[PDB]
Protein backbone atom coordinates (compact mmCIF):
# COMPACT_ATOMS: atom_id res chain seq x y z
CA UNK A 1 0.00 0.00 0.00
CA UNK A 2 1.68 3.18 -1.22
CA UNK A 3 1.38 6.03 1.32
CA UNK A 4 -0.36 9.33 0.66
CA UNK A 5 1.41 12.67 1.14
CA UNK A 6 -0.21 16.11 1.45
CA UNK A 7 1.22 19.06 -0.48
CA UNK A 8 0.34 22.41 1.11
CA UNK A 9 0.28 25.66 -0.85
CA UNK A 10 -1.54 28.99 -0.65
CA UNK A 11 -4.17 27.77 -3.12
CA UNK A 12 -4.98 24.71 -1.03
CA UNK A 13 -3.97 21.22 0.06
CA UNK A 14 -3.71 18.26 -2.33
CA UNK A 15 -3.22 14.56 -1.54
CA UNK A 16 -0.85 12.51 -3.69
CA UNK A 17 0.72 9.09 -3.61
CA UNK A 18 4.44 9.01 -2.84
CA UNK A 19 5.26 8.18 -6.46
CA UNK A 20 3.04 10.90 -7.93
CA UNK A 21 4.37 13.57 -5.56
CA UNK A 22 7.92 12.94 -6.76
CA UNK A 23 6.79 13.01 -10.39
CA UNK A 24 6.03 16.72 -10.02
CA UNK A 25 9.76 17.16 -9.31
CA UNK A 26 10.69 15.40 -12.58
CA UNK A 27 11.67 12.17 -10.80
CA UNK A 28 10.86 8.87 -12.54
CA UNK A 29 11.23 5.49 -10.82
CA UNK A 30 12.50 2.52 -12.85
CA UNK A 31 11.93 -0.69 -10.89
CA UNK A 32 11.79 -4.38 -11.71
CA UNK A 33 12.25 -6.33 -14.90
CA UNK A 34 12.05 -4.20 -18.01
CA UNK A 35 8.99 -4.93 -20.13
CA UNK A 36 6.62 -3.33 -22.62
CA UNK A 37 4.04 -2.32 -20.00
CA UNK A 38 6.40 -0.75 -17.45
CA UNK A 39 8.49 0.87 -20.20
CA UNK A 40 5.38 2.41 -21.76
CA UNK A 41 4.56 3.97 -18.39
CA UNK A 42 8.03 5.51 -18.09
CA UNK A 43 7.79 6.89 -21.62
CA UNK A 44 4.45 8.52 -20.81
CA UNK A 45 6.08 10.30 -17.87
CA UNK A 46 8.88 11.65 -20.06
CA UNK A 47 6.48 13.07 -22.64
CA UNK A 48 4.23 14.54 -19.94
CA UNK A 49 7.17 16.29 -18.28
CA UNK A 50 8.47 17.50 -21.65
CA UNK A 51 5.16 19.28 -22.26
CA UNK A 52 5.16 20.95 -18.84
CA UNK A 53 8.71 22.26 -19.29
CA UNK A 54 11.12 21.30 -22.13
CA UNK A 55 14.09 22.96 -20.35
CA UNK A 56 14.12 21.51 -16.83
CA UNK A 57 16.14 18.35 -16.31
CA UNK A 58 14.48 14.98 -15.67
CA UNK A 59 15.78 12.50 -13.11
CA UNK A 60 15.69 8.72 -13.52
CA UNK A 61 16.35 6.33 -10.64
CA UNK A 62 17.43 2.95 -12.04
CA UNK A 63 17.17 -0.25 -9.98
CA UNK A 64 16.45 -3.26 -12.17
CA UNK A 65 18.00 -6.68 -13.08
CA UNK A 66 17.60 -6.05 -16.81
CA UNK A 67 14.78 -7.22 -19.01
CA UNK A 68 13.47 -7.25 -22.56
CA UNK A 69 15.83 -5.48 -24.95
CA UNK A 70 13.09 -4.09 -27.21
CA UNK A 71 11.37 -2.38 -24.29
CA UNK A 72 14.67 -0.81 -23.25
CA UNK A 73 15.36 0.77 -26.64
CA UNK A 74 12.04 2.63 -26.43
CA UNK A 75 13.20 4.35 -23.25
CA UNK A 76 16.68 5.07 -24.64
CA UNK A 77 15.36 6.56 -27.88
CA UNK A 78 12.79 8.61 -25.96
CA UNK A 79 15.45 10.13 -23.69
CA UNK A 80 17.60 11.22 -26.63
CA UNK A 81 14.58 12.34 -28.65
CA UNK A 82 13.26 14.78 -26.04
CA UNK A 83 15.11 18.05 -25.48
CA UNK A 84 15.32 17.83 -21.63
CA UNK A 85 18.47 16.25 -20.25
CA UNK A 86 17.63 12.97 -18.52
CA UNK A 87 19.74 12.40 -15.43
CA UNK A 88 20.42 8.83 -14.31
CA UNK A 89 21.03 7.72 -10.73
CA UNK A 90 21.85 4.08 -9.97
CA UNK A 91 20.21 2.75 -6.80
CA UNK A 92 21.02 -0.76 -5.65
CA UNK A 93 22.13 -2.18 -8.98
CA UNK A 94 22.00 -1.78 -12.76
CA UNK A 95 22.15 -4.90 -14.93
CA UNK A 96 22.66 -5.11 -18.72
CA UNK A 97 19.60 -3.08 -19.69
CA UNK A 98 19.75 -0.88 -16.60
CA UNK A 99 23.41 -0.09 -17.26
CA UNK A 100 22.67 0.85 -20.87
CA UNK A 101 20.05 3.34 -19.69
CA UNK A 102 22.33 4.54 -16.88
CA UNK A 103 25.21 5.43 -19.20
CA UNK A 104 22.70 6.80 -21.74
CA UNK A 105 22.02 9.77 -19.46
CA UNK A 106 23.19 13.26 -20.30
CA UNK A 107 26.94 13.80 -20.11
CA UNK A 108 27.89 15.14 -16.70
CA UNK A 109 24.53 14.16 -15.15
CA UNK A 110 25.13 10.42 -14.61
CA UNK A 111 25.44 9.35 -10.98
CA UNK A 112 25.62 6.18 -8.92
CA UNK A 113 25.58 5.46 -5.21
CA UNK A 114 28.84 4.23 -3.62
CA UNK A 115 27.66 0.65 -2.93
CA UNK A 116 25.83 0.14 -6.23
CA UNK A 117 26.72 -2.84 -8.43
CA UNK A 118 26.77 -2.44 -12.22
CA UNK A 119 26.82 -5.54 -14.45
CA UNK A 120 26.98 -5.59 -18.25
CA UNK A 121 26.60 -8.59 -20.56
CA UNK A 122 25.73 -9.38 -24.15
CA UNK A 123 22.11 -9.95 -25.25
CA UNK A 124 20.37 -13.24 -24.50
CA UNK A 125 17.91 -14.88 -26.87
CA UNK A 126 16.69 -18.14 -28.32
CA UNK A 127 14.65 -19.47 -31.21
CA UNK A 128 13.15 -22.88 -32.02
CA UNK A 129 12.30 -23.87 -35.57
CA UNK A 130 13.77 -24.58 -38.98
CA UNK A 131 17.43 -23.98 -39.76
CA UNK A 132 16.50 -21.25 -42.25
CA UNK A 133 14.58 -19.34 -39.58
CA UNK A 134 17.44 -19.78 -37.09
CA UNK A 135 19.87 -17.97 -39.40
CA UNK A 136 17.39 -15.09 -39.69
CA UNK A 137 17.00 -14.75 -35.92
CA UNK A 138 20.70 -15.39 -35.30
CA UNK A 139 21.61 -12.54 -37.65
CA UNK A 140 19.10 -10.27 -35.92
CA UNK A 141 20.47 -10.77 -32.41
CA UNK A 142 24.04 -10.27 -33.63
CA UNK A 143 23.10 -6.94 -35.22
CA UNK A 144 21.51 -5.89 -31.93
CA UNK A 145 24.69 -6.87 -30.07
CA UNK A 146 26.89 -4.80 -32.36
CA UNK A 147 24.40 -1.94 -32.27
CA UNK A 148 24.23 -1.92 -28.46
CA UNK A 149 28.03 -2.11 -28.15
CA UNK A 150 28.41 0.87 -30.50
CA UNK A 151 26.04 3.00 -28.42
CA UNK A 152 27.66 1.95 -25.14
CA UNK A 153 31.08 2.85 -26.55
CA UNK A 154 29.79 6.28 -27.59
CA UNK A 155 28.47 7.20 -24.15
CA UNK A 156 31.23 5.48 -22.17
CA UNK A 157 33.93 6.74 -24.54
CA UNK A 158 35.79 3.42 -24.61
CA UNK A 159 36.86 1.80 -27.86
CA UNK A 160 34.50 -0.61 -29.60
CA UNK A 161 37.05 -3.42 -29.37
CA UNK A 162 37.41 -2.94 -25.61
CA UNK A 163 33.64 -3.03 -25.15
CA UNK A 164 33.34 -6.27 -27.13
CA UNK A 165 35.85 -8.18 -25.00
CA UNK A 166 34.45 -6.84 -21.72
CA UNK A 167 30.81 -7.55 -22.62
CA UNK A 168 31.45 -11.10 -23.89
CA UNK A 169 30.69 -12.41 -20.39
CA UNK A 170 29.15 -10.98 -17.23
CA UNK A 171 31.38 -8.23 -15.82
CA UNK A 172 30.31 -6.93 -12.42
CA UNK A 173 31.46 -3.38 -11.69
CA UNK A 174 31.47 -1.10 -8.65
CA UNK A 175 30.69 2.60 -8.42
CA UNK A 176 34.36 3.73 -8.52
CA UNK A 177 35.11 1.31 -11.36
CA UNK A 178 32.16 2.66 -13.35
CA UNK A 179 33.54 6.20 -13.11
CA UNK A 180 36.84 5.25 -14.73
CA UNK A 181 35.13 2.96 -17.24
CA UNK A 182 32.88 5.84 -18.33
CA UNK A 183 29.43 4.46 -17.45
CA UNK A 184 28.94 7.26 -14.89
CA UNK A 185 30.42 10.69 -14.22
CA UNK A 186 30.52 11.00 -10.42
CA UNK A 187 29.42 9.39 -7.15
CA UNK A 188 26.89 10.92 -4.73
CA UNK A 189 28.44 10.05 -1.37
CA UNK A 190 26.85 12.79 0.76
CA UNK A 191 24.91 16.03 0.38
Amino acid sequence: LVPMVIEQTSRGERSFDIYSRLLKERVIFLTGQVEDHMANLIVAQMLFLEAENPEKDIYLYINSPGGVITAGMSIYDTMQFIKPDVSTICMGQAASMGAFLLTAGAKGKRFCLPNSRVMIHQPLGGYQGQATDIEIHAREILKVKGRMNELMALHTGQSLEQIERDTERDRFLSAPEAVEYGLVDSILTHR
Binding site: S10, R11, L22, E25, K56, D57, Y59, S87, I89
Partner: protein, 338 residues
Protein backbone atom coordinates in the same frame (compact mmCIF):
# COMPACT_ATOMS: atom_id res chain seq x y z
CA UNK B 1 9.88 68.70 -1.42
CA UNK B 2 13.34 67.26 -0.74
CA UNK B 3 15.12 65.22 -3.37
CA UNK B 4 14.99 61.40 -3.16
CA UNK B 5 18.65 61.28 -2.11
CA UNK B 6 17.94 63.64 0.79
CA UNK B 7 14.94 61.53 1.82
CA UNK B 8 17.14 58.42 1.82
CA UNK B 9 19.59 60.14 4.17
CA UNK B 10 16.84 60.78 6.72
CA UNK B 11 15.70 57.16 6.52
CA UNK B 12 19.30 55.98 6.94
CA UNK B 13 19.42 57.73 10.32
CA UNK B 14 16.61 55.60 11.78
CA UNK B 15 16.62 52.55 9.45
CA UNK B 16 19.76 50.58 8.56
CA UNK B 17 20.38 47.58 6.33
CA UNK B 18 17.51 48.31 3.90
CA UNK B 19 19.23 50.85 1.65
CA UNK B 20 17.74 49.29 -1.49
CA UNK B 21 14.17 49.58 -0.18
CA UNK B 22 14.78 53.21 0.83
CA UNK B 23 15.67 54.02 -2.79
CA UNK B 24 12.35 52.65 -4.05
CA UNK B 25 10.31 54.49 -1.41
CA UNK B 26 12.30 57.72 -1.77
CA UNK B 27 11.67 57.97 -5.51
CA UNK B 28 8.06 56.77 -5.23
CA UNK B 29 7.14 59.16 -2.41
CA UNK B 30 8.96 61.98 -4.19
CA UNK B 31 6.75 61.51 -7.25
CA UNK B 32 3.56 61.43 -5.17
CA UNK B 33 4.47 64.66 -3.40
CA UNK B 34 5.66 66.16 -6.69
CA UNK B 35 2.22 65.53 -8.18
CA UNK B 36 0.55 67.13 -5.15
CA UNK B 37 3.09 69.96 -5.20
CA UNK B 38 2.36 70.43 -8.92
CA UNK B 39 -1.32 71.04 -8.22
CA UNK B 40 -1.60 73.60 -11.03
CA UNK B 41 -1.92 70.85 -13.69
CA UNK B 42 -1.59 73.38 -16.50
CA UNK B 43 -1.11 70.82 -19.25
CA UNK B 44 -4.12 68.69 -20.15
CA UNK B 45 -2.29 65.50 -19.18
CA UNK B 46 -3.44 63.96 -15.89
CA UNK B 47 -0.83 62.49 -13.54
CA UNK B 48 -1.54 59.02 -12.12
CA UNK B 49 -0.98 57.78 -8.58
CA UNK B 50 1.68 55.13 -7.93
CA UNK B 51 1.14 52.73 -5.02
CA UNK B 52 3.99 50.82 -3.38
CA UNK B 53 3.90 47.17 -2.30
CA UNK B 54 6.29 46.21 0.51
CA UNK B 55 7.27 42.54 0.76
CA UNK B 56 9.47 41.70 3.73
CA UNK B 57 9.74 39.49 6.81
CA UNK B 58 8.26 40.28 10.20
CA UNK B 59 9.98 42.99 12.21
CA UNK B 60 12.05 44.05 9.20
CA UNK B 61 11.13 47.76 9.37
CA UNK B 62 8.09 48.00 7.07
CA UNK B 63 6.00 49.96 9.57
CA UNK B 64 8.92 52.13 10.70
CA UNK B 65 9.53 53.24 7.11
CA UNK B 66 5.96 54.58 6.91
CA UNK B 67 5.97 56.95 9.89
CA UNK B 68 9.60 57.99 9.33
CA UNK B 69 8.62 59.55 6.00
CA UNK B 70 5.70 61.36 7.61
CA UNK B 71 8.02 62.72 10.30
CA UNK B 72 10.26 64.24 7.63
CA UNK B 73 7.38 65.72 5.60
CA UNK B 74 4.68 66.53 8.16
CA UNK B 75 1.51 64.74 7.03
CA UNK B 76 -1.07 62.60 8.86
CA UNK B 77 -0.16 58.92 9.09
CA UNK B 78 -2.49 56.01 9.85
CA UNK B 79 -2.04 52.24 9.97
CA UNK B 80 -4.50 49.45 9.24
CA UNK B 81 -4.49 45.65 9.14
CA UNK B 82 -6.03 43.40 6.49
CA UNK B 83 -7.15 40.97 9.20
CA UNK B 84 -9.30 43.72 10.73
CA UNK B 85 -11.23 44.23 7.47
CA UNK B 86 -11.58 40.56 6.49
CA UNK B 87 -15.06 40.40 8.07
CA UNK B 88 -16.57 41.01 4.60
CA UNK B 89 -19.66 42.60 6.20
CA UNK B 90 -20.41 46.24 5.34
CA UNK B 91 -16.82 46.77 4.20
CA UNK B 92 -17.71 50.29 3.06
CA UNK B 93 -18.01 51.43 6.68
CA UNK B 94 -14.55 50.23 7.76
CA UNK B 95 -12.67 51.45 4.67
CA UNK B 96 -14.01 54.98 5.14
CA UNK B 97 -13.29 54.65 8.87
CA UNK B 98 -9.60 54.45 7.96
CA UNK B 99 -9.93 57.96 6.53
CA UNK B 100 -11.75 59.05 9.70
CA UNK B 101 -8.74 57.93 11.73
CA UNK B 102 -6.44 59.86 9.39
CA UNK B 103 -8.64 62.96 9.70
CA UNK B 104 -8.22 62.87 13.49
CA UNK B 105 -4.52 63.66 13.04
CA UNK B 106 -5.20 66.05 10.13
CA UNK B 107 -7.45 68.40 12.17
CA UNK B 108 -10.34 67.16 9.99
CA UNK B 109 -8.92 69.02 6.97
CA UNK B 110 -9.62 67.41 3.59
CA UNK B 111 -6.67 69.10 1.88
CA UNK B 112 -4.16 68.18 4.58
CA UNK B 113 -5.69 64.71 5.00
CA UNK B 114 -5.39 63.97 1.27
CA UNK B 115 -1.60 64.28 1.56
CA UNK B 116 -1.49 61.61 4.28
CA UNK B 117 0.39 58.34 3.88
CA UNK B 118 -1.68 55.23 4.58
CA UNK B 119 -0.04 51.92 5.51
CA UNK B 120 -1.45 48.38 5.56
CA UNK B 121 0.14 45.11 6.68
CA UNK B 122 -0.52 41.36 6.55
CA UNK B 123 -1.92 41.48 3.02
CA UNK B 124 -0.94 37.83 2.43
CA UNK B 125 -3.60 36.60 4.87
CA UNK B 126 -6.55 37.79 2.77
CA UNK B 127 -4.97 36.31 -0.36
CA UNK B 128 -6.02 32.74 -1.13
CA UNK B 129 -10.74 36.17 1.12
CA UNK B 130 -11.23 36.94 -2.56
CA UNK B 131 -14.25 39.17 -1.91
CA UNK B 132 -12.41 41.52 0.44
CA UNK B 133 -9.83 42.22 -2.28
CA UNK B 134 -12.65 43.43 -4.54
CA UNK B 135 -13.40 46.21 -2.05
CA UNK B 136 -9.74 46.97 -1.33
CA UNK B 137 -8.80 47.67 -4.96
CA UNK B 138 -11.45 50.39 -5.19
CA UNK B 139 -9.82 52.23 -2.28
CA UNK B 140 -6.39 52.14 -3.93
CA UNK B 141 -7.59 53.11 -7.41
CA UNK B 142 -9.40 56.13 -5.95
CA UNK B 143 -12.82 56.64 -4.38
CA UNK B 144 -14.68 59.42 -2.58
CA UNK B 145 -15.66 58.48 0.98
CA UNK B 146 -18.00 60.57 3.12
CA UNK B 147 -17.08 61.06 6.78
CA UNK B 148 -18.86 62.87 9.63
CA UNK B 149 -17.55 66.38 10.42
CA UNK B 150 -15.29 66.21 13.53
CA UNK B 151 -17.58 63.72 15.22
CA UNK B 152 -20.54 65.40 16.88
CA UNK B 153 -23.77 64.04 18.31
CA UNK B 154 -25.28 63.86 14.79
CA UNK B 155 -25.03 65.73 11.49
CA UNK B 156 -26.97 65.80 8.20
CA UNK B 157 -25.81 64.27 4.93
CA UNK B 158 -24.98 67.76 3.63
CA UNK B 159 -22.41 68.47 6.36
CA UNK B 160 -20.69 65.09 5.80
CA UNK B 161 -17.11 65.64 4.67
CA UNK B 162 -16.13 63.86 1.45
CA UNK B 163 -12.42 63.09 0.96
CA UNK B 164 -11.05 61.80 -2.33
CA UNK B 165 -8.71 58.83 -1.89
CA UNK B 166 -7.11 59.25 -5.33
CA UNK B 167 -4.62 61.77 -3.91
CA UNK B 168 -3.70 59.60 -0.88
CA UNK B 169 -0.65 57.34 -1.03
CA UNK B 170 -1.37 53.74 -0.03
CA UNK B 171 1.37 51.31 1.05
CA UNK B 172 0.14 47.71 1.28
CA UNK B 173 2.88 46.01 3.25
CA UNK B 174 3.06 42.26 3.67
CA UNK B 175 5.16 39.22 4.48
CA UNK B 176 4.91 36.43 1.89
CA UNK B 177 6.76 33.53 3.51
CA UNK B 178 5.74 30.92 0.93
CA UNK B 179 6.43 33.12 -2.11
CA UNK B 180 10.16 32.33 -2.03
CA UNK B 181 9.47 28.72 -3.01
CA UNK B 182 7.38 29.86 -5.98
CA UNK B 183 10.16 32.11 -7.27
CA UNK B 184 12.81 29.39 -6.94
CA UNK B 185 10.59 27.01 -8.92
CA UNK B 186 10.14 29.52 -11.76
CA UNK B 187 13.73 30.83 -11.78
CA UNK B 188 15.83 27.98 -10.34
CA UNK B 189 15.60 24.23 -10.91
CA UNK B 190 12.16 22.73 -10.33
CA UNK B 191 13.50 19.97 -8.07
CA UNK B 192 13.05 20.04 -4.30
CA UNK B 193 12.83 16.37 -3.28
CA UNK B 194 15.33 14.47 -5.44
CA UNK B 195 19.03 13.84 -4.95
CA UNK B 196 20.04 16.76 -7.16
CA UNK B 197 17.60 19.16 -5.53
CA UNK B 198 18.64 21.96 -3.17
CA UNK B 199 17.32 21.27 0.34
CA UNK B 200 19.82 23.45 2.24
CA UNK B 201 17.12 24.67 4.65
CA UNK B 202 19.63 26.13 7.13
CA UNK B 203 17.20 29.09 7.77
CA UNK B 204 19.92 31.60 6.73
CA UNK B 205 17.69 32.80 3.85
CA UNK B 206 20.55 34.81 2.33
CA UNK B 207 19.25 33.73 -1.08
CA UNK B 208 15.78 34.98 -0.09
CA UNK B 209 17.07 38.55 -0.32
CA UNK B 210 18.07 38.33 -3.98
CA UNK B 211 15.40 35.71 -4.74
CA UNK B 212 12.53 37.92 -3.58
CA UNK B 213 14.07 40.82 -5.53
CA UNK B 214 13.07 38.92 -8.70
CA UNK B 215 9.38 39.15 -7.72
CA UNK B 216 7.12 39.39 -10.77
CA UNK B 217 3.33 39.35 -11.19
CA UNK B 218 3.47 35.63 -12.06
CA UNK B 219 4.53 34.61 -8.56
CA UNK B 220 1.87 36.83 -6.97
CA UNK B 221 -1.04 35.27 -8.87
CA UNK B 222 0.16 31.82 -7.80
CA UNK B 223 0.02 33.05 -4.20
CA UNK B 224 -3.69 33.84 -4.77
CA UNK B 225 -3.60 37.58 -5.49
CA UNK B 226 -5.99 38.70 -8.22
CA UNK B 227 -4.39 40.39 -11.27
CA UNK B 228 -6.47 43.56 -10.89
CA UNK B 229 -5.12 44.22 -7.39
CA UNK B 230 -1.53 43.64 -8.53
CA UNK B 231 -1.93 46.17 -11.34
CA UNK B 232 -2.78 48.95 -8.89
CA UNK B 233 0.56 48.30 -7.09
CA UNK B 234 3.18 49.03 -9.77
CA UNK B 235 6.02 49.91 -7.38
CA UNK B 236 7.49 47.03 -5.36
CA UNK B 237 10.02 47.31 -2.52
CA UNK B 238 11.64 44.19 -1.06
CA UNK B 239 13.37 43.86 2.31
CA UNK B 240 15.72 40.88 2.54
CA UNK B 241 16.23 40.15 6.27
CA UNK B 242 17.71 41.54 9.50
CA UNK B 243 20.95 39.73 10.35
CA UNK B 244 22.37 39.14 13.81
CA UNK B 245 25.06 41.75 13.21
CA UNK B 246 22.46 44.17 11.85
CA UNK B 247 20.50 43.90 15.10
CA UNK B 248 23.59 44.96 17.06
CA UNK B 249 23.81 48.10 14.93
CA UNK B 250 20.11 48.88 15.48
CA UNK B 251 20.70 48.77 19.24
CA UNK B 252 23.06 51.80 19.12
CA UNK B 253 23.45 53.26 15.60
CA UNK B 254 19.92 54.77 15.24
CA UNK B 255 19.29 58.30 16.50
CA UNK B 256 16.58 57.19 18.95
CA UNK B 257 18.48 54.02 19.74
CA UNK B 258 17.16 51.61 22.35
CA UNK B 259 20.36 51.85 24.41
CA UNK B 260 20.24 55.65 24.33
CA UNK B 261 16.68 55.62 25.69
CA UNK B 262 17.66 53.61 28.77
CA UNK B 263 20.99 55.44 29.12
CA UNK B 264 19.14 58.76 29.35
CA UNK B 265 16.77 57.33 31.95
CA UNK B 266 19.72 56.34 34.13
CA UNK B 267 21.62 59.59 33.49
CA UNK B 268 18.89 61.80 34.96
CA UNK B 269 18.70 59.47 37.97
CA UNK B 270 22.36 60.30 38.69
CA UNK B 271 24.22 57.18 37.48
CA UNK B 272 25.63 56.55 34.02
CA UNK B 273 25.12 53.34 32.03
CA UNK B 274 27.60 51.38 29.92
CA UNK B 275 26.59 48.72 27.38
CA UNK B 276 29.48 46.41 26.54
CA UNK B 277 29.68 44.99 23.03
CA UNK B 278 29.59 41.48 24.53
CA UNK B 279 26.11 42.15 25.92
CA UNK B 280 24.88 43.28 22.49
CA UNK B 281 25.53 39.92 20.81
CA UNK B 282 23.70 38.12 23.62
CA UNK B 283 20.65 40.32 23.07
CA UNK B 284 20.90 39.95 19.29
CA UNK B 285 21.24 36.17 19.51
CA UNK B 286 18.11 35.94 21.67
CA UNK B 287 16.13 38.05 19.20
CA UNK B 288 17.21 35.86 16.27
CA UNK B 289 16.07 32.66 17.97
CA UNK B 290 12.76 34.26 19.00
CA UNK B 291 12.21 35.37 15.35
CA UNK B 292 10.83 38.76 16.47
CA UNK B 293 13.47 40.78 14.62
CA UNK B 294 14.01 44.17 16.22
CA UNK B 295 10.74 44.01 18.20
CA UNK B 296 12.15 41.61 20.79
CA UNK B 297 15.09 43.93 21.53
CA UNK B 298 12.93 46.20 23.69
CA UNK B 299 11.51 43.34 25.77
CA UNK B 300 14.88 41.61 26.25
CA UNK B 301 16.59 44.81 27.42
CA UNK B 302 13.72 45.84 29.70
CA UNK B 303 13.70 42.49 31.49
CA UNK B 304 17.48 42.60 31.97
CA UNK B 305 17.26 46.14 33.39
CA UNK B 306 14.11 45.46 35.44
CA UNK B 307 15.99 44.16 38.49
CA UNK B 308 18.45 47.07 38.64
CA UNK B 309 15.70 49.64 38.02
CA UNK B 310 13.87 48.34 41.10
CA UNK B 311 16.85 48.52 43.49
CA UNK B 312 19.00 51.28 41.96
CA UNK B 313 16.81 54.21 43.17
CA UNK B 314 16.80 52.94 46.76
CA UNK B 315 20.51 52.10 46.59
CA UNK B 316 23.17 54.82 46.74
CA UNK B 317 26.93 55.21 46.15
CA UNK B 318 26.58 53.56 42.70
CA UNK B 319 28.86 55.88 40.73
CA UNK B 320 28.41 53.89 37.50
CA UNK B 321 26.76 50.73 36.19
CA UNK B 322 28.11 48.28 33.60
CA UNK B 323 26.47 45.40 31.73
CA UNK B 324 28.02 42.31 30.15
CA UNK B 325 26.90 39.16 28.35
CA UNK B 326 26.57 37.37 31.70
CA UNK B 327 23.88 39.82 32.82
CA UNK B 328 21.81 39.10 29.71
CA UNK B 329 21.84 35.38 30.49
CA UNK B 330 20.39 36.17 33.93
CA UNK B 331 22.94 34.25 36.00
CA UNK B 332 24.93 37.40 36.83
CA UNK B 333 24.02 40.76 38.37
CA UNK B 334 24.95 44.10 36.70
CA UNK B 335 28.31 45.35 37.90
CA UNK B 336 28.16 48.41 40.17
CA UNK B 337 30.89 51.05 40.49
CA UNK B 338 31.50 52.86 43.79
Amino acid sequence: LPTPHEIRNHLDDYVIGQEQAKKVLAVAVYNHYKRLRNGDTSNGVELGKSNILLIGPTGSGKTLLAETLARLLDVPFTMADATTLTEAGYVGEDVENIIQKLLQKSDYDVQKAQRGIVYIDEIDKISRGEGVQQALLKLIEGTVAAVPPQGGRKHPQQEFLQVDTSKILFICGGAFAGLDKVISHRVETGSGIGFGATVKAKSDKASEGELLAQVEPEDLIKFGLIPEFIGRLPVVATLNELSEEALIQILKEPKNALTKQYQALFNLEGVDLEFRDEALDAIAKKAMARKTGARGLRSIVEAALLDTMYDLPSMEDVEKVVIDESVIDGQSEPLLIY
